[PDB]
Amino acid sequence: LPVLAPVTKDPATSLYTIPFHDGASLVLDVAGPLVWSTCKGEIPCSSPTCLLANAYPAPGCPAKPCTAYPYNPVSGACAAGSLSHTRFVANTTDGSKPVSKVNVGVLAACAPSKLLASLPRGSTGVAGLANSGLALPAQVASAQKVANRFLLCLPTGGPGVAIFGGGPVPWPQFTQSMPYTPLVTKGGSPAHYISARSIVVGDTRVPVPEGALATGGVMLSTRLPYVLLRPDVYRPLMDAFTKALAAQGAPVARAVVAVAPFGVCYDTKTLGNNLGGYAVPNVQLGLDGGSDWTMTGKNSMVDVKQGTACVAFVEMKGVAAGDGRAPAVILGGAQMEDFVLDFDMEKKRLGFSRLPHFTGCGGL
């Protein structure tokens, strides 16, 4: 059967974790090709296992027993490590509720304890959920003879849901009419990409070069809570967003001093609250397949301090505008919270159902 783990949003870091074994959790990394962790205080390097393990070099690391290079996606740190067998301990499921305990044997890299920097308390490493052979969903697929497919329901708080192995999508009251959009595989990346053709803010549609929103130009990540944006997209989207916000005798939104790393922040005393979160313009990502990905305040605004919420669109640094080698948009975690996501890497399609305001992944 498919394997179910509950998903905790860490209050301090905002990262998402699942229980791994023995009171230890792993950070979910939807762009991560590896399951890695710190080890208890023998694969050959020419083998298919080892090639799968180094198929996607980690940015700051180069390349006879096998050596992988575990990547902390928050710090950007990497380090050498040996591959090793370990237990993924969870429950089986036939929809969304636990049937019974199960141990899945999975290959994971061993990381030096310094790569735990920047990760949540209780986390001894990272469960990579990317489309590669040693990511957790692939490993569970072969081990359990289930589909190379997984479901995420990232929570705002409370326990959300991660199911590895597919089978039918639960909660038909929210998922029966679930729209799909292709997964685009980009050369030299195991990350999951999708394609957007338009952004809409309020009713005003945003003007970007026709085809700065290209095939596979949107990446999904759980590394940051906010959206990262290429400059040709950032400037137009943020212009339209601040304007629609200013034009909303209700109190007009007052900008405060930007907080790192955000570009535009606001005094919350001056923001309204509606059912979608802070009363800011809705945002519509028009995805291939004819259905939109929507962001309300809860997705487009991050609380940073008491008194201050910032706009969850951040400009990518060190990147030239309109550069096809980079994604135009990198959706992050707060934009995926309270969506049921079916990553189907066999049919190569992402299912996305936005939960309505009165419920959420947490406690579902």
Added chain:
Amino acid sequence: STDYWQNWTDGGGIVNAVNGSGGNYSVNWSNTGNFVVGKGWTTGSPFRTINYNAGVWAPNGNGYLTLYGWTRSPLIEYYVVDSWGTYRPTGTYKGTVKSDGGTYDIYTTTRYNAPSIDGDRTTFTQYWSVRQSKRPTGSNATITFTNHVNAWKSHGMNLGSNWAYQVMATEGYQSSGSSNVTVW
């Protein structure tokens, strides 16, 4: 007579909502994400009797025809659902209550770090009374809110002391539909 107009959309698909004369409103929608429209009162009361007539109730997909409201001290979101579309809303079952000719299941749900009338990231409980079968519409109907409040009280579901809005609402999601409701 009603003094409040609820009208929220997440912007998905088309939601044409009309604030009509006195207590009347209508909603026509297609291919939505999520919306909540209703007429009621700025300050809810636990002793309010809500009369309404749903001239039109025509969902194609999910939608609720429901009393909807909030309190603070403590923060509570509540629903008394009279009819719905394809799926009936449920939760953690607590008990039942007979009122206004129908019988309702009572549910709670806890909402964590979620949107409320008070903020972006807020933790609170939700109270539901959900009719066990869809209620007829087209005729004049009554919701004796006290019956619900009292039944809720008996299952340890206390409402707050500070009352915010209270409306007879059309909620829709991932659907199309029409609504025409007159509230008083």
